[PDB]
Amino acid sequence: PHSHPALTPEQKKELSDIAHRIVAPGKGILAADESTGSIAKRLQSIGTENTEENRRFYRQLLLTADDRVNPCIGGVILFHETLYQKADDGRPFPQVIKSKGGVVGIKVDKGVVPLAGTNGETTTQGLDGLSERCAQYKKDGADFAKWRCVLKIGEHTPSALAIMENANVLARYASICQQNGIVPIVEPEILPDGDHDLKRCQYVTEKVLAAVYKALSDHHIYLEGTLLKPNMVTPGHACTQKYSHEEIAMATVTALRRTVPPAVTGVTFLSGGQSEEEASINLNAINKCPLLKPWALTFSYGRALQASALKAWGGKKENLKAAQEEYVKRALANSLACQGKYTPSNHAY
Amino acid sequence: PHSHPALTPEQKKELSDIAHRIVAPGKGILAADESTGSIAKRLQSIGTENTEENRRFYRQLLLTADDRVNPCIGGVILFHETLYQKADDGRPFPQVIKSKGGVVGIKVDKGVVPLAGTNGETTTQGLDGLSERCAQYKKDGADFAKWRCVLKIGEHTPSALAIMENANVLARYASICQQNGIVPIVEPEILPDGDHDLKRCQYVTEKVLAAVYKALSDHHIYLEGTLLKPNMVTPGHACTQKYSHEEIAMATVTALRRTVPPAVTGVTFLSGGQSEEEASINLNAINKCPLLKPWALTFSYGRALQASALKAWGGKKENLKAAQEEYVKRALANSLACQGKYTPSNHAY
Amino acid sequence: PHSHPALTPEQKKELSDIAHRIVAPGKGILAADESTGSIAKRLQSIGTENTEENRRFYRQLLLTADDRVNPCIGGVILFHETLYQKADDGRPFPQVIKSKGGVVGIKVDKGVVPLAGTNGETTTQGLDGLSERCAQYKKDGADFAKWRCVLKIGEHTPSALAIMENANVLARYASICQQNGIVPIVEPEILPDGDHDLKRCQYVTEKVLAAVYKALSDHHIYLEGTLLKPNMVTPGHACTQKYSHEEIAMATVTALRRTVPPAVTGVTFLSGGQSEEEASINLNAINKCPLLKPWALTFSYGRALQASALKAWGGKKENLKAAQEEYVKRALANSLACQGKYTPLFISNHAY
Amino acid sequence: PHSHPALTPEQKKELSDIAHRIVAPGKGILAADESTGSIAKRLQSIGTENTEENRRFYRQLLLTADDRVNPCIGGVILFHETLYQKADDGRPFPQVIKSKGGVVGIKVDKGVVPLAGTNGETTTQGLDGLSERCAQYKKDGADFAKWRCVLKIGEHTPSALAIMENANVLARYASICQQNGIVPIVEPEILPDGDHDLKRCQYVTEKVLAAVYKALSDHHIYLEGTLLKPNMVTPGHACTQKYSHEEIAMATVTALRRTVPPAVTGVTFLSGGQSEEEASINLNAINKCPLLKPWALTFSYGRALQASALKAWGGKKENLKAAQEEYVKRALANSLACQGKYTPLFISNHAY
Amino acid sequence: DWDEDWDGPKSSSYFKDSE
Amino acid sequence: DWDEDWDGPKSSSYFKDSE
Amino acid sequence: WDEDWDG
Amino acid sequence: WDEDWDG
């Protein structure tokens, strides 16, 4: 029942101001934070050699797209390697992001690990030396972070253990970030895998988010200096029931209204298995939902911003402008969608 | 991870519609639910004999005040005896309340009981046969209920036990109400007793409300069909630091924004130890707070609606109109204040 | 992190002494605490009228069996009505029980209630005015209580809510008992209903008992002044896998060793739909289990002590001695069984 | 309510067998797992240079003491560097330990980190890549691990957060160990720092251990393949109230009986700032305590086994035998003490 | 009037013994 | 380099024995 | 006793 | 493996 304040008013202002910039009206996040292994798969799919140079050039292509992206992109999240790369002109990639009005983010987790005694459930590692890593990343230009937890809907899952443990590790990570002037994005990703319907996903989302916010309270997290990164509430990929975008929007907004305190600055959606178009249409329907939404409802999109751009590039320097156009189109679509404006004695002891 | 829905869409609509009527713009609650012992003390203070007739007449005085109260009073909460009393004209008191556009409430708890091994902490009893009591009260005209939990700020209090246990019992009570078409008002009252400052009360409120909403989630409570009845965030009564109404408003709204999901229909404040005027001024400052407030912020006032009316009555039938005027004045003040418009092997095992 | 002790050294001594008397070596509990409607059905089965007199006589028959039961019976639990009934000589039933060296118990819960949003799961009610009820029962000669929580093994059950909620209500009840000098028997009954195997029951027992002991710690329960009343770890009654008595014993003792702190004075097993003789054999195998067992492992049996006595009586006054003899035989068998000293395939067509 | 077993019967057998070897009757643990900087400070105190060779020689001196130590030492815990060092004959230190009948242990945590929003409280880090570290340590001859969590008794400490968080991290670490055939020693160290009395320490121990065992149940930890490493229940070192050894024993045994399931293979006590001799006397009084103790009650001592050996060596090669003799004396005293068979007013002016 | 001890599901031995 | 086992607060008997 | 009316 | 990229 005793306050030992984690943060001064100055630290709170600094974190709150960063969180607000990322999710400012019309803005969302480019998730360009794929691991070297993931991005190797991206390059293979377009018949391109996984060299550091091709990874660097591909990230340059996204980061140096023209000024039409500037009102669209509040934040850009990077993987470790990319934070220390440079554009052809010699500018560090963080400087490229900042000059276009973007806040720089860093993915800080060290991947999922199996939880013993569960049906294939995971937690996430990466807390070790995280404070020193955050302090260094801050100095190197990052103002926000990402930590991804993964949950799955199945017969016995998410279990009481998986929920408790993932919510706890998210709160630990968020606590360490906030000590270092870094806005933590809290990402409890519930996978769309399986044949469960919309109602089941809504139920699981409600339970997971109530556990997340309880853990954030237990660990003294300052919610105004945080963002939330969930999946939209959708049927499973193998569900045979068809749903309108308005039903997805209503299930999503309802689940958030029931669990997410209004102090949370913004919700930056994952796009799960959605196409570029579907991700934008669903985000738009969420923002058009006729219910009071006391937080920014925006995007943190990887594939949903990048898929057409990656294909149009095809590893060809000649296709630079055509590839950037595809990314600009998705940035413009998503910027409208996050505004709801998108139309495609032992007794003494 | 499995939904066994507590409520149908029809039950949800019924509960949500009742909750919305009680806290509709400009409206709050008259708490006229004092026990026979408390109301004996009220009558004693004005030199009046504690007869059932004097209790009945006093409640009639409040309930039959003129039509100026009708836009002010969304709900009236009663004690058991009063639910079954009648006005001089023969109308049951619930009928009197309903005809003026008020929803009828019933206090259902059976008082506080000591928690063993704590420093004078309590929980609340009253769950036994509560379902059958709710079903009967519904038939007899009640559409909402109150259950009061009490917490105290002190050196070792509220303890982990007191928080956990009071949040759990509130969830049990809320669950039973919702099965019977009764809107539960969830009342975690944190006493203003002691010399703690504003920041300490804010901290305790945040911790208590996070435990309350986690318990409501665990017990599958439908938040849209609930109201919250907390104290405002204030210094303790023996604190020597002075605070403006705007500081109380900011501490209160901040604490609610950090813990209370937007799905909660409304917050109906207790007035703790505040005078009639102070209760109205603080409620007004809360509604003027320049932060997004996604729920109705209103009053559930007993003494803060009744004190001048009780005094002006003085047990004299001749003073009926003068006494009702005092109550009307407070109902008008509080109606403006809730709008921000008030100006005063064994190994195989 | 701060002690405001629930109990004085003198209150602890009294609770520990009571708990130790109930489960002293060779002793267990007669559960004779069936409600009026339940006991009416027992009387119906033997063609006897449901009268207050027949209920009183049947309870007298059990309570006034000869002195051979005295070393077998540490406790007798009564339903409310029986606590206020008298033997033929005018002696209150609590006095009859005490004179034979038994501790008197009282069932204090007010039954199961549905948990909304669960798949048919329950909690238990009975906390309201429980303190004043306990203080009165104590004056009236009771020194221990019973509160029954019910959990079911099924597809999504027991749920996180049902486990947490029943553990919490058991801890509230235990706390109130201990303030009034009443030993609480903590009863988290996991039903043998269904087709689950032995492994599943063991897993569920271990999870439930861990949550029970956490709740009792949170609520400052004095473990030495408590008893635990679970089912044995068995397959579900619709499971077709067959197990030896030694396998049931190993799974039961393993589950308790993994969850039950040594400070708990004793474990008084339910019979869980077992035959009279099977309940004795399983209790015996438990006590012979070659693992360290730091608590008394005994019986709290109702039907498993009474079934043959009820039939041998058949509502006939002339049959008093034959009926008492059937009860004495089971008391003696169970007294040997709770010391590991008891020495006494099948397809039922009704299962098809 | 669903079992997806963490471990096979074969994995359980291996973990249980290791845990039982470490704490076999008469045996305890030599904690020789001080970091480089710590051991440099031990060398400074005896006027010896901090060289890799002096560190290696000092560890050799302890590990190669005469065969009288063999029945006394069930386990030796090493710091990372020492696990890869060799004796003068070229034998790897794990092989030296094994040849004398000891199990090899490894300290795996990466130190305490501050919990923000608390009054100077900590959690412990070291989970990242812990699985691959364990698998490598197992290949390199270690069969048990150590992870140290720290809790402090103060005005608002240990807080609900610190208890919950340290219990959770202990359970994560234990889970990872058991997947790799490593016995986890679960170490929730409650500091004897401060002026709290014996009652307050007992209360805090009971609350911490209840939360520890709930967390291990939630994370599906196999208790038989674990050990517990707590402080003894004592007043704080700044408390002026004096207690007998029998009072410390009673408070310690009572706290463990109320919280530690009998399935836990053993309790390996820290010395908690006690003198070499005092830690033996207290461990002995614990083993003589007239309450049922269903687990091995033994030592995991560092300074309490080494202090006199370190001084008797003084960095001089000629002093090898005299130094080993001091360690053997303490090993022998502690071996008798963990069987209850050890038989061997004061105000310090430095406290003013 | 349901009594789990008397009325609840029985073991196969209960059936064998009462046959 | 802080080591609780070696550097931490000591009992009165630690002081008596090393006096 | 009444908390709302008694200070 | 990337979940976002491999649906």
HEC string of chain B equals CCCCCCCCHHHHHHHHHHHHHHCCCCCEEEEECCCHHHHHHHHHHCCCCCCHHHHHHHHHHHHCCCHHHCCCEEEEEECHHHHCCECCCCCEHHHHHHHCCCEEEEECCCCEEECCCCCCCEEECCCCCHHHHHHHHHHCCCCEEEEEEEECCCCCCCCHHHHHHHHHHHHHHHHHHHCCCCEEEEEEEECCCCCCCHHHHHHHHHHHHHHHHHHHHHCCCCHHHCEECCCCCCCCCCCCCCCCHHHHHHHHHHHHHCCCCCCCCEEEECCCCCCHHHHHHHHHHHHHCCCCCCCEEEEEECHHHHHHHHHHHCCCHHHHHHHHHHHHHHHHHHHHHCCCCCCCCHHHC
3-state secondary structure of B189: strand
CA B78, CA B29: separation in Å to the nearest integer?
11
CA D234, CA D242: separation in Å to the nearest integer?
10
Burial class (CB in 10 A: 0-12, 13-18, 19+), G6: exposed
Helix or strand run (H / E) with residue B301: strand B296-301
Tell me if there are at least 3 CB pairs under 8 Å linking chains F and A: no
Helix or strand run (H / E) with residue B33: none
Residues 6+ apart with CB under 8 A from A159: A118, A119, A121, B1, D2
Prior bond of A344 cis (ω within 30°): no
User: Do the beta carbons of residue C205 and residue C190 sit within 8 Å?
Assistant: yes
CA A32, CA A85: separation in Å to the nearest integer?
13
Whose tokens are 């009780």? That residue is B310
CA B11, CA B24: separation in Å to the nearest integer?
20
* Interface touch C278/E14, C-beta < 8 Å: yes
Nearest Cα neighbor of B142 from B66, B61, B75 is B75
User: Do the beta carbons of residue B262 and residue A294 sit within 8 Å?
Assistant: yes
Helix or strand run (H / E) with residue D76: strand D73-78
Residues of C within 8 A of A345 (CB-CB) are 9, 13
Residues of D within 8 A of C2 (CB-CB) are 203
Marked catalytic residue, from B14, B34, B165, B187 = B187
C217 is in an annotated binding site: no
Detail the residues of D annotated as belonging to a binding site for beta-D-fructose 1,6-bisphosphate: 42, 271-273, 300, 303
The one-letter amino acid code at B95 reads Q
Nearest Cα neighbor of D165 from D132, D226, D124, D222 is D124
Nearest Cα neighbor of A303 from A36, A49, A57, A62 is A62
Nearest Cα neighbor of A176 from A231, A120, A211, A137 is A137
Q: How far apart are the first and last CA of chain H?
A: 10
CA A243, CA C94: separation in Å to the nearest integer?
67
Interface of C with E (CB under 8 A): 31, 34-35, 37-38, 40-42, 150, 189, 191-193, 234, 237-238, 270-278, 302-303, 346-348, 350-351
Residues of A within 8 A of D156 (CB-CB) are 2, 4
CA D300, CA B251: separation in Å to the nearest integer?
50
Question: In CATH terms, is domain D1-352 a member of 3.20.20.70?
Answer: yes
Q: How far is CA A333 from the centre of its chain?
A: 18
Q: What is the DSSP letter of B61?
A: H
Distances from the Cα of A334 to the Cα of A232, A275, B1, angstroms: 15, 13, 32
Residues preceding gaps in chain C (C to N > 2.5 Å): 344
Q: Min CA distance, D133 vs chain A (Å)?
A: 14
What's chain B's length in residues? 349
Runs of H (alpha helix) within C100-197: 130-139, 160-179
Binding partners of H (≥3 Cβ pairs within 8 A): A
**B208's torsion region: left (phi>0), alpha (psi -120 to 50) or beta?**
alpha
Q: What is the DSSP letter of D154?
A: S
Residues 6+ apart with CB under 8 A from D279: D269, D271, D272, D299, D301, D304, D334
What's chain G's length in residues? 7
User: Within an 8 Å CB–CB cutoff, is residue A118 touching chain B?
Assistant: no
Residues of D within 8 A of A226 (CB-CB) are none
CA C124, CA C164: separation in Å to the nearest integer?
12
- CATH code linked to domain B1-349: 3.20.20.70
CA C152, CA C150: separation in Å to the nearest integer?
7
Residue of A nearest to B198 (CA): A3
Q: Min CA distance, C14 vs chain A (Å)?
A: 9
CA B1, CA A207: separation in Å to the nearest integer?
8
Count other Cβ atoms within 10 Å, centred on residue D34.
26
- Write the DSSP assignment of C192-216 as a string of letters: --SS--HHHHHHHHHHHHHHHHHHH
Count other Cβ atoms within 10 Å, centred on residue D82.
25
* Interface touch B345/D13, C-beta < 8 Å: yes
Q: How far apart are the first and last CA of chain D?
A: 58
Burial class (CB in 10 A: 0-12, 13-18, 19+), A241: exposed
User: Within an 8 Å CB–CB cutoff, is residue A175 touching chain D?
Assistant: yes
User: Within an 8 Å CB–CB cutoff, is residue A160 touching chain C?
Assistant: yes
* For chain C, counts of helices (H) and of strands (E): 12, 10
Whose tokens are 């046969």? That residue is B129
Runs of H (alpha helix) within C69-197: 80-83, 93-99, 130-139, 160-179
Residues of D within 8 A of C293 (CB-CB) are 262
Helices B198-218, C160-179: crossing angle, 10 deg rounding = 120
CA A125, CA A122: separation in Å to the nearest integer?
10
CA C12, CA B279: separation in Å to the nearest integer?
48
CA A74, CA A268: separation in Å to the nearest integer?
11
B330 is in an annotated binding site: no
Tell me if there are at least 3 CB pairs under 8 Å linking chains E and F: no
Which one of C122, C128, C234 makes the best mutation probe of the B interface by having the most chain B beta carbons within 10 Å?
C128
3-state secondary structure of C132: helix
The interface residues of chain C toward chain A in range 2-21, judged by CB-CB distance below 8 A, are: 9-10, 12-13, 16
Under 8 Å CB pairs connecting chains C and D tally to 79
The interface residues of chain A toward chain B in range 249-278, judged by CB-CB distance below 8 A, are: 254, 257-263
CA B154, CA B192: separation in Å to the nearest integer?
10
β-partners of residue C236 are: none
C330 is in an annotated binding site: no
3-state secondary structure of A92: strand
3-state secondary structure of A269: strand
Token pair of D344 as six digits: 């061997």
Count other Cβ atoms within 10 Å, centred on residue C348.
15
Token pair of D199 as six digits: 């009652």
CA B71, CA B333: separation in Å to the nearest integer?
12
Whose tokens are 């917050």? That residue is B267
Prior bond of D158 cis (ω within 30°): yes
Binding partners of E (≥3 Cβ pairs within 8 A): C
CA D125, CA B19: separation in Å to the nearest integer?
47
CA B260, CA D102: separation in Å to the nearest integer?
57
**Resolution, rounded to a tenth of an Å?**
2.2
Give A217's Cβ-side CA count (13 Å radius): 29
Tell me if there are at least 3 CB pairs under 8 Å linking chains H and B: no
The one-letter amino acid code at B101 reads G
Residues 6+ apart with CB under 8 A from B192: B201, B231, B234, B235, B236, B237, B272, B273
Helix or strand run (H / E) with residue A153: none
Q: What are phi and psi of D118, to 5 degrees?
A: -110, 165
Is residue B229 flagged as an active site residue? yes
Spell out the domain ranges in chain D.
Answer: 1-352
Active site residues of D: 187, 229
Beta-strand pair B296-301/C28-32: unpaired
Tell me if there are at least 3 CB pairs under 8 Å linking chains D and E: no
Active site residues of A: 187, 229
Residues of A within 8 A of B153 (CB-CB) are 1
Q: Min CA distance, B8 vs chain C (Å)?
A: 11
Q: What are phi and psi of C104, to 5 degrees?
A: -90, 130
User: Do the beta carbons of residue C172 and residue C212 sit within 8 Å?
Assistant: no
Active site residues of C: 187, 229
A42 is in an annotated binding site: yes
Binding partners of A (≥3 Cβ pairs within 8 A): B, C, D, H
B273 is in an annotated binding site: yes
Strand spans (E) along A57-199: 73-78, 103-107, 112-114, 122-124, 144-151, 183-190
* Interface touch C128/B131, C-beta < 8 Å: no
CA B30, CA B33: separation in Å to the nearest integer?
9
Helix or strand run (H / E) with residue D300: strand D296-301
Distances from the Cα of D212 to the Cα of A249, C74, C310, C339, C346, angstroms: 42, 35, 48, 33, 45
User: Do the beta carbons of residue C102 and residue C74 sit within 8 Å?
Assistant: yes
